[PDB]
């Protein structure tokens, strides 16, 4: 077999260390776009995000509202595609063409839209019914796809890429994964993917443990495929954006997320808290919360996970305004007024084991 | 004294790391046939179970009924040494002739047998009695057998295989040990065993600390038992089967301990849950539970360990078969079809310590 | 992004190995003097605290009182300049004309004094109204000033520090920070700060993670910027004495943190649990407490941060002199006559994760 | 300062490896006998015990009836020096004259005795009043002396030995200590000392961290002070027994203790728990219990430390039988049939942060 020589890290072992704040580092002149899929070495992405955040492809989170709520605020939902081809091709029309009309034939400066005003939106596919539900998503509308799955690194996603190249050519935008080595980015990479998602056990609502037993640190994982997604670029003039997947608990992970390399990050349990989430809201002794389930339950996959609850906290606007406000004053602390600066400049240190309590409250009450 | 450069790890420190996944990896198409018994180079062993699972030498795990459910799935039961010799041999005895009949003289397609088409079967013995016991074991038609010890690296164990070689030949299979590293493997493997088991204080029912404080994390022994026995093959021609024994919590523990080179795993509590183990059932407050104690306890050796409770699990089929689905999805996930190309393919990591976290479900209730 | 080779260390995660202890290294013959700002080699600074103790700039901890009680004491305190121009300056002229009398017109020694026999006090400034607010504290007869950020990498800080230098040239002292590593000691260094502040995140009152994500373990960060001010004063000539500002739980850390190289400490919870802390002494349930709010909760800068309690110590003055104690002991057994001498013959180890149990009682009732 | 390259580590980390146990190892032909005091290449110490257990320098554990009975069983006690110096010799005088007689003038084949047959004992001392303890301890009959202290690094216990050596030469033997690393065995090494004690901070009534934080785990002393008493050894002949005291939780760890290269072990907690230490014994809720107070609480020196209570375990006798032949156990385990003979042989490896758990019982009730 083969062994590694470091044992794999997850985002609450990491800190950043600050650098240079200069004069103009604002929060409000931060600048948080991001390439949503690969282009050639001086071009710009076909695509580019407002803010590097996209809700995760699950039944609990992605539907039509959250879709139209995160697009306002700049970036982009993934359909989840667990559901009948028919019925993730109508929630995409219905995004598409919200900005038309409520009834029938009787502005926002931050809002991710197409060169026709309308929101954009993403959808999820799998190694299996693409042949009909691609078609589908693509006639209604869908400005990019991502193939589902828990282990990315499939000869499966390289026919299905390989599918829509020949039948749409580089038209049709889709994303792959997961992966969490230089390996299987690689493999997708020659594959055709235009983003390659990374992560494996992380998510909230998965137990690799009592599964398994599959699965890499999240930040391991991101600093490990991002190095051979930038090895990618010089070799090829490609360069395929990154999706950290899943492991997000604090405002400061995301910002970690980034720093490492990763050009935006998927999340789940972040965007299921909100309003605009799908689920129920059900008030249990006084604390209003809603329904998140993964797409491994037996809950989803029924049309390996868990099914659980997560506290309301409200429309989704407000909490990512302050969420990305946070993220703006770290890194101007680290001297970035970019993403790509702060990917270029981030002090990035390992926090000890026998630590950790000294970076939050002690000794009080 | 001695000093290594490494702490030692065990099973729940580990995680794998996916590999490329072929369209015709598929659970079903996984074989998990692995060999009992040592070889020659371009051989193959006399002896291949059809699952790399073996029940524990123990009272409370191997008895006739455990056998008969085990060989029937594919796997092989060492039934108990710490019995009278009569008494060890009538039980191998009714496991060989189950085929015959209930009274007197008034179609499992994965059943390990031998070519009178009889249910195989193993029987542990000890160091002291084996003139007596060996006999009346191989008469009674024992397929292989096994020295039971905690600390196989014993001159015992030489003079005991010694003289069934002498007695014998190679003829008659015994297994020796526990060891936890290569030369106690190497000194049983110039002994004459024909496998050597693995495990020093991973046992569930062990506990070293409140004892000797001997022992090695399960992991660390296997891996460098495996170098040992994979450069004694180099050297010798000899490929001699291992054993992964005690530890397994999960049921990716298995596939961990497969990946890094054990042929074959023997478990205790696992067994011991079942309908099918020789322990009476019993019902606590609603909990239907097993009785389950070691070989060291005093509640054994009365004819150093722990006499505890387990919860039933039902019937012995089910629960391999789940176990089993589960290893086999995991080895496709690596891109492995058989044990030896996932021993040879898997990508296996350390977790770190302030870790472990992200991996089961986190922050929701 | 720029990894590190090791992972951040806390004062908790060291002990000091005693060295020889002469026959004359008794408590009472230990020096605790130690320089508070920047000056050439060859030269005194021209201010040294008779005690490695400054209170921290905090609405809760350093009022006139506090300051008063602590330069009877030897050490210094930071008015906080989290209140009006006109407030900060009135306390600092109440120290400063403390001696003079309590009606109108109608003997420690160690105590930090002036040539004109008045007690020192320091005032923390902000990089905002420090035009307005340095004028009238060196009117006020402030003897040194702090800019109060926590990431004082920034070029709001070299501006201030300049206007103070082109303004008042090297008359008017003042501290600069916080940073954690040598880019940033060295930036405020070429800046001109007198002293420079060390620590982001360890602060008892600071929560890292349900924050922004930046800082470091107090040991680590205190250690390498020791080091850089080493090599500064090596190239330059110049010596800046540097403070370890926060995560001080034990007394033994005030030995580590000096130990390690800082010339002295500065402390909030510390002092807040004293009689002379401005805050309101409170019973609670048989407990009597003291409040204690770091600057950045919103109960601080309505004129981030964390609202608490802190058990009631008593006077400053046995406390002060309890804790000293036990730091001069230690220095003895670690051969140290003097906080320099500390410096040069302290022998620091790191902990084990795995321990630190053993380091207190245990398996005692 | 001065760092080292490796955190300390403390028994509960490591575990014995097996190596080759011959037919000729069994328990009752372990010895366990091993020297006291120092002596040249080729020769014997003048005095070995025959158990490698020393009872602490404790008022709450070495009185008159814990050095008989110790000494009965092959070990020896240190009659505790925080009393009188009339009070402590007289204790000594009880028990070098006990076989004489319990009024007036009106069978153990392991026993520690002199050539008249008395048993032997030991007295602590201290750097202050020896001038007039020492001689009435060697009147009194004392066989062996030790200087009682937390940190032993000290010019005083030079001062003291000198005295000693230069008034009765090398005809009264003192121990010195403690100490933790090389430097300190060598400083008191070349200032004389028959034995050098090893240990600050793991004793179980001493709390390092609410004190002075001083101290090191007692694993890595006693593995860096053998290696410094082996390199002693070789440049001038003189073979220094050393003794690691303090921190022993399990039986287990006298066996690492000893296989590190400790020529015997000094217990306080394990010997207070019998009936013959001079403590009371309390009953508690059904539990009966012995005190337990360190020499450094105020409790003792008032003729630092905690008092607290430990349970009963009966007479000394039985518990020292089964602790031993546990560790005689283990020896064979090591292929050891004498402590030096384990020194030599021993395999110590140690274990992960993240482990230990399946060292113990797990996973069942
Ligand atoms: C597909 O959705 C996921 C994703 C993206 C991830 C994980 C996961 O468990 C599931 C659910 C797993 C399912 C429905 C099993 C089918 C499959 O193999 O894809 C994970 O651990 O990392 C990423
Ligand atoms: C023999 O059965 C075992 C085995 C196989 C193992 C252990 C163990 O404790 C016992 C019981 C130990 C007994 C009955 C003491 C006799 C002996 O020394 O064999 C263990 O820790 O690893 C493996
Ligand atoms: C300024 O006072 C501090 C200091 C000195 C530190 C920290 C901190 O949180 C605050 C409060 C932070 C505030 C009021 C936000 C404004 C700012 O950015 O300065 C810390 O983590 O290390 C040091
Ligand atoms: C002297 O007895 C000890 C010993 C041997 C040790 C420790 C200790 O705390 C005390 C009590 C400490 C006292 C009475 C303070 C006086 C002194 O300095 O000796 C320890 O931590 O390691 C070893
Ligand atoms: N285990 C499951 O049932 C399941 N369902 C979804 N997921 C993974 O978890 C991610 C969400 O993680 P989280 O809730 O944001 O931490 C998804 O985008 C996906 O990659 N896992
Ligand atoms: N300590 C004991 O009393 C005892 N009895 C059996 N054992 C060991 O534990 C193994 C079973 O481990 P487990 O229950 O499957 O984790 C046995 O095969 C044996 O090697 N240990
Ligand atoms: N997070 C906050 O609101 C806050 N307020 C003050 N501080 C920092 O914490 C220090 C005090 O730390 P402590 O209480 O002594 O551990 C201050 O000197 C400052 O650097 N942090
Ligand atoms: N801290 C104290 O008050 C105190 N008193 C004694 N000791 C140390 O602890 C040892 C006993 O440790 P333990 O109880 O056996 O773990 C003593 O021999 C001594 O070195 N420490
Ligand atoms: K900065
Ligand atoms: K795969
Ligand atoms: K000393
Ligand atoms: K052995
Ligand atoms: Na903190
Ligand atoms: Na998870
Ligand atoms: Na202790
Ligand atoms: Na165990």
Redesign the interface.
Known sequence: ????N?????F????????????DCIPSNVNLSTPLVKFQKGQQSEINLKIPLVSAIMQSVSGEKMAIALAREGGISFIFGSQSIESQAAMVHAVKNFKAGFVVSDVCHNELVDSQKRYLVGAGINTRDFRERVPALVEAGADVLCIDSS?G????QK?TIGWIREKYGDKVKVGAGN???G??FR?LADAGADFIKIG???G???????????????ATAVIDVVAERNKYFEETGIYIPVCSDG?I?????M??AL???ADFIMLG?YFARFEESPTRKVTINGSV?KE?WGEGSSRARNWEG?D???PYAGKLKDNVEASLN?VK??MC??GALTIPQL???????????????????????
Chains 1, 2, 3, 4 share one sequence.
Request: proline share 2%; aromatic share 10%; glycine share 12%.
């Open positions: 077999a083969k062994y590694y470091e044992p794999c890290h997850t609450n072992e990491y800190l950043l260390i600050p650098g240079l704040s200069t004069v282990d690194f499939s000869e499966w026919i992966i969490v080595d390996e299987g493999y494996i056990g992380g909230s609502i998965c137990i690799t443990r009592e599964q398994k037993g599959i699965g890499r640190g999240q492991g608990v604090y405002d400061y992970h910002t970690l720093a490492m390399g349990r919360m998140y868990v659980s609850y997560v946070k004053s770290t602390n680290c990917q270029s400049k981030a002090k990035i240190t390992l926090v000890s084991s026998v630590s950790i309590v000294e970076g939050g409250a002690h000794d009080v009450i």
